[PDB]
């Protein structure tokens, strides 16, 4: 809904002053690794199905209290609902990733959300466990640091790109809490 270009421009309306020639040089540093970001986020959609398949299986294995009756992921409809509530996180954080800007979160998903989860009795610790899985899924996937997934990209640094996505799931775990 808002991006990294116009992230500074609402701040530039906040002074009611002209944009410089200097303040937009941060956009150049953002802009040189744009092809790096596109070498990254394709790997974010590389095995996103395997990512979430990994995520809820790796969340349920330390906590099979949800498979107990009354546990939130006992019912297979509740399990698919858990998959549905999970896959939009993979949507929304990567919308913010290609934005270079965390704007799609707070207007599409974060508001009214933990209120529903306490209205539905959804255990929040299971969701922060699942999203913390994702935070290390993503930085492993943007690199070639996976067990069998070798998404070979043009060599060099994506720690800028890793710090970008690590600056995204934190707000996810924060707003659901």
């Amino acid at each position: 809904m808002l991006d990294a270009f116009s992230r500074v421009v609402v701040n530039s309306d906040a002074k009611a002053a002209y944009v410089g020639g200097s303040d937009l040089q941060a956009l150049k540093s953002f802009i040189a690794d744009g092809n790096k970001r596109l070498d990254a986020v394709n790997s974010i959609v590389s095995n996103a199905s395997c990512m979430v398949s990994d995520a809820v299986s790796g969340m349920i294995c330390e906590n099979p209290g949800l498979i107990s009756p009354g546990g939130n992921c006992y019912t297979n409809r509740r399990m698919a609902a858990c998959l549905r509530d999970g896959e939009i996180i993979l949507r929304y954080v990567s919308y913010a990733l290609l934005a270079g800007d965390a704007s799609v979160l707070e207007d599409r998903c974060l508001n009214g959300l933990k209120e529903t989860y306490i209205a539905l009795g959804v255990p929040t610790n299971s969701s922060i466990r699942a999203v913390s899985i994702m935070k290390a899924q993503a930085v492993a996937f943007i690199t070639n640091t996976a067990t069998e997934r070798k998404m070979s990209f043009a060599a060099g640094d994506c720690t800028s790109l890793a710090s970008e996505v690590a600056s995204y799931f934190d707000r996810v775990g924060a707003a659901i809490s």
Partner: protein, 238 residues
Amino acid sequence: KFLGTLKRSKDPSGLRLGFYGRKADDFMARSIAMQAKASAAGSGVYTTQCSEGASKGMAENARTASLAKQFRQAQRSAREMSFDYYEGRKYAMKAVGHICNYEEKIFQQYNKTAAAYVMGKQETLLSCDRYAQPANKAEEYIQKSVQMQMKKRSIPYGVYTTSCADGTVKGMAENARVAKESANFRARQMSAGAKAAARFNARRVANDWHNNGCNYEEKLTSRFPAAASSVRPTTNRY
């Protein structure tokens, strides 16, 4: 059969039933709409229910935007046109609940009567999204989820399809936005008499029309009726 009057390739809509029945159908649908408009204004006042506009332009731009939407129904493919006739029969039988042996065989002979009936019945039975008022912050979220789900009919696999074309000038874009929250403000505006009954009207509408079962999720509707009002699962492609 060379040079036959009949043509293999053209475009029927289905449901044609002869030329004289087309003047029949729109007029039956017209007086059904007048019967619906004799309810919320239905004592002598024109409540903020109908709310044609809000300013200078918002009067006559809502005219041509609605006429545009009526045109977008006309220029559809025979696939979705046939499909719309097909869902219209099965939804118009789910209107009064009773199989009125005359008034069921209207709505399976006829469709814009049926479509107009479903719309005008959803307007007087204030079960709509433009009359919802979610108090809970949990309710607004799930209302949003249902709204996003609806776009899947409009956007089947990734493109917007002219079914939310919403007005076609530079100006016709911006007027729909202000006409939205003009009426969306009027959802919380009317009275305590009405809009407490809307919470029960969606409780009359969503629980039985579209979801016969799903009791664990029908209890969501009885939990959150404002999200159950904005479900809008009649396929108006909107």
